[PDB]
Subunit: 257 residues, 4 copies
């Protein structure tokens, strides 16, 4: 497959509806060797089962709020792998009130801080901690959303954090590029599932994308997964600093009129 | 003038090379009534002199790192003005190492936090604290730089913060727009002066803009000031959520080839 | 006013709902001296009346499909004015079928050709013919629409032409900038009026902008006019190669969800 | 391979330095069945040899300036293939003077017309003529350049045409998307070769990209080819209306300062 022998660490695989799950499935299909992170001891068994499904026992805890755990992640990974060829950053969080209702109603210094700390800072932080062991042709991938580019109802403080994240893709690409490392994001369309506690229903958005996107359908984690696998691979060796929309073309229209 | 009777609060007027100084000069010319903020008691005399130059004694301290000072600013201003018609956010800061040399070399959680706290969060924070006294047709203005859009050497962590700031312009515009309030940014070109301690020399950038921008010259605080006065005025009543480049057209070219 | 003594030629003033009418009204208010073009002899009396309303008898015919009429326009204008300080290009046309229904249904080589010839080529063509008599600090302005940036239903072939027009703003800015001439566009929101023969009803779009734009209202020709007057003036001397949205912020959101 | 059984027509394969050659090589590797077009009878032997290299005798003449030849192309192809799964539009032309020196110096109505006719119109024209035989999940691909987005020296009239071409990607995506057809462009970086008669030397641009792009190297036709093969494939089924940069990240920086 087109990722034969590539060693790729994936963060954020929480369930089989996780974008990271779709990415892992495509990476494994194309020949990659995988490793996984998780946060919260109650998830250790679940992530270990997912890792085994993808032929791996390489599972490590990492809360990206914690500098020591970030450093420990790579020290642990290094005991198994001399080098890292891929990193998937599929980690996002904003406090419930900061992504519901009016933008200013949910805006506080602490909500702003946490959303940017977890959703934005953590990407180049992982990249920096990984750097000593990154292969010269490594590929780093994060996930964003159209709310970084244009104001979408409720996305609010997360839209600010994602804008900073997309900027970090560009600055990382310059920093790591002379070595040969590529850095990209996928701007994914919404993925249909029941909105978890802390996230407002986005059913209306899913209906609107299905009715108005060029392809008249929502994207799947399989579609986002395949695009991710492509970007992590040498097929994409000419591509860096890119925010690739995988969203059935929805970003490119003015729908609903 | 086109700002007759408009009451406008300006932050960030530090010296006569401050972008806020150019904005204040144009606003006063067009008939505005002004008020000013400062940070650091050693600057009280200087800002008071500037305020007097612009026909005002309305001077208030405000370190935007501090929630209590933000609230106190508007309580103080309110003892003078029933309503606020304009707000100029001309406040930026990133730690020295975070805007010099390699992006990852100067990246730390705390440097990231401070740059985003001061340069990004503080804009909608001021807007939210001001909201009860904002006139229905008020206009809020911030300042950004091309480094938010594309990777520019050394801008580094400030580029991430400015991307979040430009996103905040859009989310603020939605939040405040039904009331009638407009929210915009000027993406200013570099302003020629000796780079202060904490900021790397940008002489090469100034030379490059002078040699490669469409107008073959750097922008001035007078030019940025006039564009700012326009955006704060009813001349610009159709304009909101906009990031306006005032940069001699430099953003629109690929120069130096 | 801020355009005192500026000599500005306006094309495309067809009726009192024309964007050019709003621009002319604001330019005259701010002290400009105006001249006007028209196409079609049956409109000579009407444009002459409009010109008189704005204190001018300088009226010239010009079908921009015709090289000879373009050259003759400036030869005629030159008999009155030594130099030209402003040019307003408010000319658009696409064949009826090319802006109604499906994009490919209305696509023919000739429809493509005419839409690009009249709506795009004519802007730098006028600029080139004017160049010998342009003042060193002249300002050239055209009008575009969000359909150049994202696919909007029915805009179709006009969206392609407007994308080429916005690109021409950038290339013109480089070409004319060393002399000191500025070149900009306003991306105007829809203007409420009965859609003329050849243009599909855009009532649904007007309703959608009123319901979803940040300012929750459609823009007016007065608002577009004032932004245009600003860009034509020395207030905007730092601004070139810019496409300025004057659209109540609508471009910056994802509405209707 | 990931294009197993896909039937793909490629235009514009002129030499082994053609971007279409890199695309053909990657498509064949991944299992596609190919067909080819050419213009000019003196090239019949050369394109037939290239087709044979890629396991095909399906070669057809088509000057896209000519409506009858466009229709005849698909009638001919249809005698071999019931359906078409992919179309590669790798056709560009602008008259020599229109892409050398000053933008206005090389601007004429006819130069504008030809550049837009051949480089822009021809893409949706081919799509429309192909439509009856396009598979429901077909994928159409064109090639653009950063000069569509920002002013690059000499690109001039071609920059306008490419902006219209990128807009056509979006309008085509809406038109063909309900059927299930995807439409994308690759914005390719410059490809190192001796600039042919009619094209100015771009050596300085190649040096500048090598020195300033994030990856510090120019892109190759192999890299553009692999990205093209990806977009033509079901791996990219979530991607449409996209302009993907394959340019070593150069679009995302401000270089040379
Ligand atoms: N789900 C959707 O419609 C879309 C999601 N995205 C982005 O895709 C990425 C993945 O989201 P999903 O797969 O849909 O949801 P998810 O909930 O399955 O994944 C989010 C992950 O972030 C991890 N996380 C949160 N705080 C963490 C911390 N302090 N330390 C380490 N991990 C932490 C979670 O454990 C979880 O694994 C996120 O960045 C999200 O913003 C983007 C676009 C659309
Ligand atoms: N100077 C330039 O070339 C360009 C500057 N900008 C932006 O323009 C704005 C103004 O910059 P300048 O006028 O050039 O420099 P400046 O130094 O004169 O203004 C910066 C202001 O930020 C204030 N500030 C910093 N931390 C603060 C805090 N905790 N609380 C309250 N105020 C604080 C400073 O006191 C100072 O008044 C900034 O946002 C800057 O990023 C943008 C583009 C270009
Ligand atoms: N009306 C709207 O909602 C919006 C209009 N625009 C653009 O604003 C500009 C002005 O449009 P409107 O004022 O609304 O309509 P308008 O009909 O009043 O102006 C169009 C003008 O183009 C002129 N024109 C057409 N073919 C010409 C030729 N061969 N030679 C010389 N003039 C020719 C017409 O005579 C007319 O004066 C156009 O470029 C339009 O595309 C943009 C955005 C929104
Ligand atoms: N070569 C480069 O650095 C870059 C090229 N592009 C674009 O990539 C595409 C391919 O360019 P290249 O492979 O580099 O050059 P190329 O010369 O090998 O391909 C251009 C093709 O256009 C065809 N063509 C020109 N007029 C035609 C007509 N009337 N009918 C049918 N075909 C016609 C030519 O025969 C030739 O096959 C073009 O669209 C070009 O603008 C984009 C970016 C960078
Ligand atoms: C408000 C706009 C609707 C969002 C649609 C798409 C969308 C975009 C996202 O960024 C997202 O991810 C999260 C968002 C918030 C939190 N706390 C955690 C996560 C993982 C989920 N979804 C579904
Ligand atoms: C590194 C890229 C050069 C920047 C050119 C333009 C530029 C952009 C800016 O954002 C800027 O403002 C600051 C930046 C940092 C801090 N600590 C404080 C401030 C007020 C100054 N300048 C001059
Ligand atoms: C199809 C999308 C709706 C357009 C909304 C805004 C809009 C955008 C326009 O560009 C426009 O101008 C014309 C369009 C066509 C022709 N033949 C002539 C003209 C002058 C009018 N309007 C109203
Ligand atoms: C002027 C800017 C330099 C262009 C660099 C990249 C570039 C961009 C291109 O679009 C290009 O393609 C052509 C351009 C003109 C013609 N007549 C025919 C073709 C096929 C070649 N190259 C090399």
């Amino acid at each position: 497959g087109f990722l034969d022998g590539k060693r790729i660490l994936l963060t954020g695989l929480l369930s089989n509806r996780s974008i990271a799950y779709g990415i892992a499935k495509a990476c494994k299909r194309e020949g990659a060797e995988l490793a996984f992170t998780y946060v919260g001891d109650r998830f250790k068994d679940r992530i270990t089962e997912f890792a085994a499904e993808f032929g791996s026992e390489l599972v490590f805890p990492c809360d990206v709020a914690d500098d020591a755990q970030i450093d420990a992640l790579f020290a642990s990974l290094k005991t198994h792998w001399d080098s890292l060829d891929g990193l998937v950053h599929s980690i996002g969080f904003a406090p419930r009130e900061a992504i519901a209702g009016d933008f200013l109603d949910g805006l506080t210094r602490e909500n702003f801080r946490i959303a940017h700390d977890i959703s934005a800072y953590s990407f180049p932080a992982l990249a920096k901690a990984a750097l000593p062991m990154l292969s010269d042709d490594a590929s780093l991938l994060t996930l964003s959303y159209l709310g970084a580019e244009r104001a979408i109802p409720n996305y609010n403080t997360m839209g600010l954090a994602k804008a900073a994240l997309e900027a970090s893709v560009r600055y990382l690409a310059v920093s790591l590029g002379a070595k040969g490392v590529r850095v990209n994001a996928i701007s994914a369309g919404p993925i249909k599932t029941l909105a978890a506690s802390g996230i407002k229903s986005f059913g209306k958005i899913l209906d609107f994308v299905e009715s108005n996107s060029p392809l008249k359908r929502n994207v799947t984690i399989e579609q986002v997964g395949n695009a991710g696998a492509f970007l992590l691979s040498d097929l994409a060796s000419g591509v860096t600093a890119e925010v690739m929309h995988v969203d059935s073309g929805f970003n490119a229209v003015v729908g609903g009129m």
